[PDB]
Amino acid sequence: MEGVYFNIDNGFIEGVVRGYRNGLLSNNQYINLTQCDTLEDLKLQLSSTDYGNFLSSVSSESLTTSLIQEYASSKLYHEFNYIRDQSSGSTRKFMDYITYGYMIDNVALMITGTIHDRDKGEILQRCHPLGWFDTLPTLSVATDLESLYETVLVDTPLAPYFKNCFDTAEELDDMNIEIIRNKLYKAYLEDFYNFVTEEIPEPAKECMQTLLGFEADRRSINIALNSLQSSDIDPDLKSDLLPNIGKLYPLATFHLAQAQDFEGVRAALANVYEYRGFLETGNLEDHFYQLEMELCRDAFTQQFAISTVWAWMKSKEQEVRNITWIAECIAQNQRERINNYISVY
Amino acid sequence: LEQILWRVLRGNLFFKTVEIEQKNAFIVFSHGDLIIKR
Amino acid sequence: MATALYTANDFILISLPQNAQPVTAPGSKTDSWFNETLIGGRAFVSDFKIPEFKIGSLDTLIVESEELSKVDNQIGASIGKIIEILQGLNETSTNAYRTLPINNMPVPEYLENFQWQTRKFKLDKSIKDLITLISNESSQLDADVRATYANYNSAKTNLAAAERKKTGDLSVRSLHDIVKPEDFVLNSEHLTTVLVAVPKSLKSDFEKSYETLSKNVVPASASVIAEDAEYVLFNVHLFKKNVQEFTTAAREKKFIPREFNYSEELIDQLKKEHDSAASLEQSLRVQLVRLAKTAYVDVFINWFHIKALRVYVESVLRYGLPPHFNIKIIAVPPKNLSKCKSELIDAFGFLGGNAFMKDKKGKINKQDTSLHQYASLVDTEYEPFVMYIINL
Amino acid sequence: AEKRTLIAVIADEDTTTGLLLAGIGQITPETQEKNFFVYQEGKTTKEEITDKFNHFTEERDDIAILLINQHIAENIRARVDSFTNAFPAILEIPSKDHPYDPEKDSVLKRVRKLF
Amino acid sequence: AKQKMGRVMQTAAFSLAEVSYATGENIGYQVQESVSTARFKVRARQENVSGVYLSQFESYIDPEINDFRLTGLGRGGQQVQRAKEIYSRAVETLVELASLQT
Numbered sequence: 001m002e003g004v005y006f007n008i009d010n011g012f013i014e015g016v017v018r019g020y021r022n023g024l025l026s027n028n029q030y031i032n033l034t035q036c037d038t039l040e041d042l043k044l045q046l047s048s049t050d051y052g053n054f055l056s057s058v059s060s061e062s063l064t065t066s067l068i069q070e071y072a073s074s075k076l077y078h079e080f081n082y083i084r085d086q087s088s089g090s091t092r093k094f095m096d097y098i099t100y101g102y103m104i105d106n107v108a109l110m111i112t113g114t115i116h117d118r119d120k121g122e123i124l125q126r127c128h129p130l131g132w133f134d135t136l137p138t139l140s141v142a143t144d145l146e147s148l149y150e151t152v153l154v155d156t157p158l159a160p161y162f163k164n165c166f167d168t169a170e171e172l173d174d175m176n177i178e179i180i181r182n183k184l185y186k187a188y189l190e191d192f193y194n195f196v197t198e199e200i201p202e203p204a205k206e207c208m209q210t211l212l213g214f215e216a217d218r219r220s221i222n223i224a225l226n227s228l229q230s231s232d233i234d235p236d237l238k239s240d241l242l243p244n245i246g247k248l249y250p251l252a253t254f255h256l257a258q259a260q261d262f263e264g265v266r267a268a269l270a271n272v273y274e275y276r277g278f279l280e281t282g283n284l285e286d287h288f289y290q291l292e293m294e295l296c297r298d299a300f301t302q303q304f305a306i307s308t309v310w311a312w313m314k315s316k317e318q319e320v321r322n323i324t325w326i327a328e329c330i331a332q333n334q335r336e337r338i339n340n341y342i343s344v345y
Numbered sequence: 346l347e348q349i350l351w352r353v354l355r356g357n358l359f360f361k362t363v364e365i366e367q368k369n370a371f372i373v374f375s376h377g378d379l380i381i382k383r
Numbered sequence: 384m385a386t387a388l389y390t391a392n393d394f395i396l397i398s399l400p401q402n403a404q405p406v407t408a409p410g411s412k413t414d415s416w417f418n419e420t421l422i423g424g425r426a427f428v429s430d431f432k433i434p435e436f437k438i439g440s441l442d443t444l445i446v447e448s449e450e451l452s453k454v455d456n457q458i459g460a461s462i463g464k465i466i467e468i469l470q471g472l473n474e475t476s477t478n479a480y481r482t483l484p485i486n487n488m489p490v491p492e493y494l495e496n497f498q499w500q501t502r503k504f505k506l507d508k509s510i511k512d513l514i515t516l517i518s519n520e521s522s523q524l525d526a527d528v529r530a531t532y533a534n535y536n537s538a539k540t541n542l543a544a545a546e547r548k549k550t551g552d553l554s555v556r557s558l559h560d561i562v563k564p565e566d567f568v569l570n571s572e573h574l575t576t577v578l579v580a581v582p583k584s585l586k587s588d589f590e591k592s593y594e595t596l597s598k599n600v601v602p603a604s605a606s607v608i609a610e611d612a613e614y615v616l617f618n619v620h621l622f623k624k625n626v627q628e629f630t631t632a633a634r635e636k637k638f639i640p641r642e643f644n645y646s647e648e649l650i651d652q653l654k655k656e657h658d659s660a661a662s663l664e665q666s667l668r669v670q671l672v673r674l675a676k677t678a679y680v681d682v683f684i685n686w687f688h689i690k691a692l693r694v695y696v697e698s699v700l701r702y703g704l705p706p707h708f709n710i711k712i713i714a715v716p717p718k719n720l721s722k723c724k725s726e727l728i729d730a731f732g733f734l735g736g737n738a739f740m741k742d743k744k745g746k747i748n749k750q751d752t753s754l755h756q757y758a759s760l761v762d763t764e765y766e767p768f769v770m771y772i773i774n775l
Numbered sequence: 776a777e778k779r780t781l782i783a784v785i786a787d788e789d790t791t792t793g794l795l796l797a798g799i800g801q802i803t804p805e806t807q808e809k810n811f812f813v814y815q816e817g818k819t820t821k822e823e824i825t826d827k828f829n830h831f832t833e834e835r836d837d838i839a840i841l842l843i844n845q846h847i848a849e850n851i852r853a854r855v856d857s858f859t860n861a862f863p864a865i866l867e868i869p870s871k872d873h874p875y876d877p878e879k880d881s882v883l884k885r886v887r888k889l890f
Numbered sequence: 891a892k893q894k895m896g897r898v899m900q901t902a903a904f905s906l907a908e909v910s911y912a913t914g915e916n917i918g919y920q921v922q923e924s925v926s927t928a929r930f931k932v933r934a935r936q937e938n939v940s941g942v943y944l945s946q947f948e949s950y951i952d953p954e955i956n957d958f959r960l961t962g963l964g965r966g967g968q969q970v971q972r973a974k975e976i977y978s979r980a981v982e983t984l985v986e987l988a989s990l991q992t
Contacts, residue, residue, distance in 0.1 A: 028613065035547060035555040038642050044634045065872070068911060105963060106915055118923030121818075126914040177920075178962045185964070219964065226967040231956055238962075260751030285968040292965075321912040321965070328908045334901070338969070352739050353765035356701040358441070361738075379442050780931035782985065790899065792918040793906035796970075797978030798929025798955065799985070802922075810928075813918065839932045839947060840988060845896075861945060864992035868984075869896030871903035880892070882991065 005202050009089040010306055017083055017309050025049040025319060027297060027345040033326050034339050042330045051075040051323060063331030068324045069124065076125060079316060084129040091306065093157055094195065096129060098313055100159040101188045103128025103136070107161060108184065109177040110140040111148075126317060145169040163187055178230075179238050182223055186240045189216045192310075193244070199306065207299035208307030215314070216244040217269055218291045224257030225284055234258050245269060274344075283341075290344040293318055297345075318345075347372075355383075384746055385774030387466035389477035392490065393720045396431065396690065397727060398698030398710045398769035405730040416730070417713060422722040429495030431712035433691050436510045438699070438706075447511050448700045449760040451693040454518040456756065458686040461525040465679040468528050474672055481775055485683060490775065491714050497687065504688075514692055517685040524678035524685075531671035538664030545657030552613050553580040557643050559650030566608055566618050569645025574601070575623050578641030579633055580614045589617065589638060596636070597621055597629030614639060690773065697757065698769040701735075710769075720772070721745040728766060735767020746772035779839040783831045783863065784811040785824065786844040787871050794842070810838070814847050821850045828854060831863075838863040844870035845879040856881045891987045898987075902980035909973035913966040920960055921974075929955040930978060932985060945992035949982050 025033070025046065033045045039061035047055050054071040080099055087095055106123065113120060120140075123132040130136065135155070142148055145165050152162045164184045167173050173183045192212050196205060223240035232238045239257045241250030247269045256262030267276040274287030292314075299311040322339055329336040348361045351374075358380075364371030384393075399413060408416050417428045438444055469475050486493055499506070504513050548556055558567075558578065567576040581589040589596075590605045601620035609616030621629060633640045691710075698708050715723045721744030732740030743764065746755040755772050756763055782799040784791050791813045794800065800811040812827035828851055831838055841863045848855050848867055855865060859881070867880045877883055910917045930951055937946035957974065961967030 032552060032554040032613075032639075035552060037555055040630055040634065040640055040642070041554060044639065047634075048637075065907060065911060072914075109915070109920065109963075113919060113923055116923045118919045120916065120919055123916060124914050176959065178959055181962050222964065222968065223962065226962045226964075226971070229957060230959060230961055230971075255751055262750035264750065281968055281972060285965075285972065288968075289965065317914075317965070320914070324912050325908055328904070328911060332904050332908075334904060349739070349765075350762075353763065354759060355445075356759070357735055357739075357767075358700075358703070377441055379440060380445070383442065383445060776936075777934035779934055781928050782932065787903070788918050789907035789910060790903040792910060792921055793902055793973065793977035794981055795918070795925050796906070796921050796958065796960070796974035797981035798925075798927075798958075799981055800925070801928040802926050804926070809922070813922070839934060840985065840991065842988075861992040864945070866892070866895075866988040866991045868892065868899050868988070871900060871907065875893055875896045 009091040013087045013091045021312050030345040063327035068327055072320050080129045099127055099129035104159055104161045107139050108180050112177045114140050115143055182238050182240045186242050203305050205307040208310055211295035211311050213245050218288050222288045224253050228257055232258050286338055286341040290342050293344050386463045388774045391481035391775035393715050394773050395713050396694045396771035400708045403734055406733045407730050427714035429712045432710045433499035434506050444700050448696045451514055451696050452759050454514050455689050455693040458521050458689045461521050462682045462686045465525050465682050469675045469679050494712050517689050521682045521685040524681050528675040528678040531674045535667040535671050538667045541660035542664050545660050548653055553611050558609055559653045567645045574620050576645050577619050578643040579617050580639035580641050582614050596632040597625040599625050694771055701769055731768045740767050779837045781810045781837045783838045783841045789871055825851050825854050840864045846870040846873050895984050895987045898980055906973050906977055909969045924958050947989035949986055
């Protein structure tokens with residue numbers, strides 16, 4: 001409903017997130033940036049965004065490799081640490097779990113990579129509000145479940161890696177970052193439905209349920225398509241099968257994902273999606289990005305709710321990859337393949 | 346199940362017999378002299 | 384069932400010996416038991432027998448049966464791929480090309496008159512070379528329609544790439560269809576042509592700030608020479624040295640600068656690329672339609688001959704003695720193959736054995752595993768006699 | 776006869792990551808030493824590239840062709856120009872974000888003299 | 891062949907650098923840690939039509955050697971798998987073009 005909630009904490013974070021969300025790359029800037037092939041036309045459209053402040057300070061016409069990583073790291077750190085540092089209450093505490101869930105995937109791969117005997121001297125942050133030297137090196141250096149639970153217990157609130165460490169303590173899911181990443185993606189998908197069901201009374205959310213259901217179905221279809229041709233075990237949980245809409249069964253997703261190759265769950269889930277009968281990874285990769293990009297601009301119309309900040313925090317992952325692919329492709333003198341096929345932003 | 350798999354993968358070109366042993370089971374099949382490899 | 388069956392009739396291919404009889408009618412022929420004892424009295428029986436081929440031994444018959452089953456499954460998938468490729472072009476509906484006369488004759492009349500007649504096949508050669516030649520001809524016929532569909536998709540992608548240069552948003556498009564000798568002068572090094580894309584709200588700001596946007600400009604050039612759906616196109620003439628200051632003031636004014644140069648070869652190649660892509664896609668669709676129709680007809684005839692040879696090899700390998708048997712095709716109506724399959728399987732199930740007979744009806748296929756095919760090399764359903772399910 | 780199946784790679788992290796993802800090299804478990812050396816932009820020195828090229832050139836016999844970039848090969852042009860044996864062969868290719876140069880080819884200098 | 895191999899290596903390095911920069915994580919550490927076998931190998935053969943002996947190379951791919959476990963992280967897994975397949979497809983033509991140097 002509307003007119004019954006007076007949360008000033010969501011109104012302050014909605015205005016602080018709306019101030020950075022106002023001067024951002026919209027769908028017209030991405031459509032004009034994808035069709036553009038000039039340095040002045042590409043730098044002029046991307047220069048008016050939040051990531052274009054570094055291009056305004058340091059003027060350039062050709063996008064470099066280190067400049068896109070430094071501008072994307074400063075844009076993500078300024079868009080995440082600035083909004084997270086200025087928020088308080090249940091809005092900041094609930095907003096910290098979204099960054100902790102995104103940083104838990106890199107923290108689990110760094111923790112498994114530390115026991116895997118791999119080199120590590122630089123780690124990029126996508127949506128993690130904490131740096132890779134304060135919280136990531138302590139959890140990555142520790143290899144025991146008692147030290148990971150003790151280090152996870154010091155943080156407030158608890159991160160999602162405690163349940164993955166508790167499930168992985170008995171050796172019930174996998175001994176790699178693949179099955180722990182799929183089970184962590186399924187538990188992260190269930191945590192959004194639990195938080196959306198818990199916050200359904202005070203805040204009114206309608207676009208967050210459709211964006212969470214479409215992002216959960218596209219994340220389950222992308223997780224099932226990612227385990228295809230990769231030697232996925234049928235007994236272990238690796239396809240991310242779970243009920244989130246009502247038209248996706250676990251036997252159809254895991255059976256069609258593992259060794260069956262049955263795209264009936266895509267057409268049975270919906271007919272307005274980009275891929276419902278396709279079987280190629282190239283068209284399914286652009287169709288999953290076009291389906292995940294939808295429900296983002298329409299969710300930004302409503303204000304005074306965390307559903308707009310939930311899709312706005314998830315839009316920076318596709319916007320950073322689209323801006324990095326468009327800036328690297330246009331700066332590298334080449335044509336975009338995944339960015340040219342996508343039209344929904 | 347071996348007779349069902351042999352009948353499903355080779356048709357009716359075999360013999361289905363069973364003999365009680367001391368546990369074990371005595372089986373015997375009959376076919377051509379040139380189909381010993383198959 | 385089938386991926387291309389919408390309103391087509393179903394047929395069941397059965398094979399039995401010439402001295403067999405049913406279990407529900409002792410002392411009666413199989414033709415009278417199929418015609419009179421059929422479910423509902425509307426069962427249509429047609430001849431499906433063919434001439435016998437030279438057999439060397441059972442070892443070559445087993446490998447010919449496995450290669451005939453794999454070539455029958457590959458021809459069945461190749462027929463559905465050409466049927467889906469022909470249905471995707473919008474040249475055949477869900478009630479045409481599945482229930483109409485194919486090969487200039489009906490499905491029951493052409494199937495009843497199919498006595499192993501070919502124009503490139505013989506009756507004294509090996510069946511393995513004819514089945515492999517038919518499977519290679521159907522695979523090449525489906526590969527030709529797939530290559531024609533890929534070339535039509537590439538021509539449609541080239542036409543879609545030329546459509547962005549032909550019109551749309553002024554970000555990659557260049558004016559090559561509205562250029563004249565009175566709006567763009569590039570005959571000397573003093574004057575040049577620079578395009579500036581401005582919005583509808585910023586038209587007065589670009590028209591008023593056009594004189595102060597750069598030094599050495601040409602007045603009276605504020606006109607709508609081109610129009611878009613997100614911005615307006617304006618023409619401005621100035622020196623080449625002032626393009627950096629005009630582009631800097633245009634970028635500071637929140638405008639969209641366009642890099643365009645006066646050249647007839649760019650507009651001629653830009654129009655010739657879209658015309659060649661449109662003519663190439665238009666010829667590729669017309670060639671792909673007839674190639675898909677001829678590949679569908681040749682894949683249908685090769686699928687029918689491969690199905691008859693696979694049914695004869697499966698009946699000869701599964702039956703043993705005698706070498707000759709009664710092979711016919713029974714035409715069933717739509718949504719009636721379960722009763723004829725359960726009655727024919729229950730009636731003819733006692734011929735093979737009482738331990739390998741089970742109740743089954745219809746044909747249920749799956750994406751993970753195609754069932755009800757009677758495969759002799761992979762795990763699938765099996766019956767006492769030769770039984771094949773064909774869904775048109 | 777065939778006595779080498781692995782290929783050495785000495786390039787940037789993008790080309791070395793694509794070549795390692797393609798499966799041209801691997802890590803032998805007999806000594807726990809990889810068959811490739813990643814070149815960090817500004818992090819590695821010329822002594823590690825010359826030690827890795829010297830260890831992969833004569834210290835190993837399973838390397839069929841030794842890959843080297845034009846930018847990384849310029850700092851090792853003395854040791855790369857001094858090595859002219861075909862076992863393993865040295866193929867100078869263009870580096871990432873760099874154009875083709877005829878002066879960065881050791882085979883072109885010896886092939887140019889007395890051609 | 892050195893110019894075409896340099897152009898194809900520049901395109902494959904640009905696509906792998908675009909996929910690695912778009913992934914947002916160190917893909918080289920996970921690819922180097924998960925890489926313990928050689929999927930694409932070469933065969934040394936003696937094909938000499940001349941006064942002396944020549945060295946030839948033939949590209950071979952193992953059928954049991956599947957794709958490396960580097961996918962399954964959401965959107966970056968499909969781009970890493972397609973970048974690995976395009977990197978191997980460019981690496982086969984790069985080795986086949988660079989085989990004549992010996």
